[PDB]
Amino acid sequence: QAPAYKKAAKKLAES
Secondary structure: OOOHHHHHHHHHHOO
């Protein structure tokens, strides 16, 4: 589950 690190960061930018 490595991309979970980039998925969470993206959701923060897509808030």
